[PDB]
Amino acid sequence: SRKTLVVTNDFPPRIGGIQSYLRDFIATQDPESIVVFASTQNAEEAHAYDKTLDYEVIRWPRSVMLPTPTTAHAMAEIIREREIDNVWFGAAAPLALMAGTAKQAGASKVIASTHGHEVGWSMLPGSRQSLRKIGTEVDVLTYISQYTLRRFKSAFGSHPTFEHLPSGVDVKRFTPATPEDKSATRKKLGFTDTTPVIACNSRLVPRKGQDSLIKAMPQVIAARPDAQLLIVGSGRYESTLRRLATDVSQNVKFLGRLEYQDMINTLAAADIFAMPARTRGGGLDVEGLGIVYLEAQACGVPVIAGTSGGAPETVTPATGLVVEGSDVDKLSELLIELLDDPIRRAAMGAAGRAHVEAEWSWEIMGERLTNILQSEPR
Numbered sequence: 324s325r326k327t328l329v330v331t332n333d334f335p336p337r338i339g340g341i342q343s344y345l346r347d348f349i350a351t352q353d354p355e356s357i358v359v360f361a362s363t364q365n366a367e368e369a370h371a372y373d374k375t376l377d378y379e380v381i382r383w384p385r386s387v388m389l390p391t392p393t394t395a396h397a398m399a400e401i402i403r404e405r406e407i408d409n410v411w412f413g414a415a416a417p418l419a420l421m422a423g424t425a426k427q428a429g430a431s432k433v434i435a436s437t438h439g440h441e442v443g444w445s446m447l448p449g450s451r452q453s454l455r456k457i458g459t460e461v462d463v464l465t466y467i468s469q470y471t472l473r474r475f476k477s478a479f480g481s482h483p484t485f486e487h488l489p490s491g492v493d494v495k496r497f498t499p500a501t502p503e504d505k506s507a508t509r510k511k512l513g514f515t516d517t518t519p520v521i522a523c524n525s526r527l528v529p530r531k532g533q534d535s536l537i538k539a540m541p542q543v544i545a546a547r548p549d550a551q552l553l554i555v556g557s558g559r560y561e562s563t564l565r566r567l568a569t570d571v572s573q574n575v576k577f578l579g580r581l582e583y584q585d586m587i588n589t590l591a592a593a594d595i596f597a598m599p600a601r602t603r604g605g606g607l608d609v610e611g612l613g614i615v616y617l618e619a620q621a622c623g624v625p626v627i628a629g630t631s632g633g634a635p636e637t638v639t640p641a642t643g644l645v646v647e648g649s650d651v652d653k654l655s656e657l658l659i660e661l662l663d664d665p666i667r668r669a670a671m672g673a674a675g676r677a678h679v680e681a682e683w684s685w686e687i688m689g690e691r692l693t694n695i696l697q698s699e700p701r
């Protein structure tokens with residue numbers, strides 16, 4: 324059994340996307356075969372958190388872990404002391420620039436994980452050269468979607484083998500609602516069993532397409548007068564969204580940022596989950612994957628996804644629909660059509676749940692990581 328050291332600046336108790344990614348991936352592995360080397364933002368909160376774990380965390384007593392000689396030295400010592408076989412950089416740029424030292428220290432395999440940022444790194448000349456240096460020193464480069472791969476593949480070069488490793492979804496916590504729970508949730512919101520409910524859970528920023536949803540509502544409301552768009556989340560774009568929703572205000576609910584379990588109950592009680600993501604920022608503001616799509620399918624709820632980035636990759640023709648956010652006529656048509664067909668909706672949600680259980684759970688994704696970390700080097 325090969326032993327892995329994960330080297331990261333992004334680790335709990337701090338809250339974030341990479342933090343969740345690593346935490347949930349590490350928990351899929353045998354805890355005796357895992358050591359973490361992480362920076363420390365608050366010493367007493369880090370110690371309190373590390374004591375809840377069944378695997379070792381070694382804290383680097385700096386607020387940010389940077390690719391420096393002292394950090395590489397410390398990483399090297401751990402590699403030899405703990406007899407490390409795999410070195411895993413939880414985020415490729417810039418920390419995986421220490422991959423050379425990992426090989427010098429005696430590690431037989433170096434893995435680096437990309438997420439969203441390396442797409443932006445693909446554009447600048449010097450930034451692109453750092454991606455090349457990482458690529459020459461890393462044996463396995465993981466990516467969240469076929470879209471992100473296409474964007475940065477040539478920057479990294481052909482030395483590493485490229486492996487698909489997106490986040491999974493907890494299929495025991497994101498689970499279809501009982502008729503009891505769903506009915507009670509709706510009453511909590513001031514709705515009934517018959518209220519048409521569209522849910523959008525996401526940060527309130529232009530690219531998520533809550534603006535597109537709001538502009539599609541007049542037609543939906545005309546067709547289904549009691550239809551409700553639930554906007555779950557917070558963000559800078561809220562005030563613009565509230566202004567867009569002025570004339571449809573009776574049918575749009577800004578629920579703000581909900582507690583974790585309330586967010587799951589609200590989602591599971593919805594008829595449709597919609598988030599018509601578009602690409603903005605000159606091609607830089609993109610949906611890398613879209614975990615919310617996987618969470619909706621896990622709750623057995625039909626999905627409307629956008630054309631942005633890796634968003635289409637989350638759904639099948641059986642489980643969800645892919646739409647252009649700016650196409651308001653089509654988005655409205657799709658929502659009304661889906662709201663008027665409860666048989667199709669029941670079929671799409673069932674297929675969505677089966678889809679995540681077959682391809683997107685932490686059990687499935689954990690098996691993929693096991694394969695990467697436990698296979699002999701080529």
Ligand SMILES: Nc1nc2c(ncn2[C@@H]2O[C@H](COP(=O)(O)OP(=O)(O)O)[C@@H](O)[C@H]2O)c(=O)[nH]1
Pocket residue numbers: 340524525526555556557579580581582583586612613614615616618
């Ligand atoms: N508890 C809670 N979680 C939310 C809320 N809005 C979004 N999220 C979570 O934030 C995550 C969003 O990730 P993702 O979809 O990938 O989009 P990203 O943030 O852009 O990367 C998902 O896991 C959501 O469940 C909210 O209002 N409450």
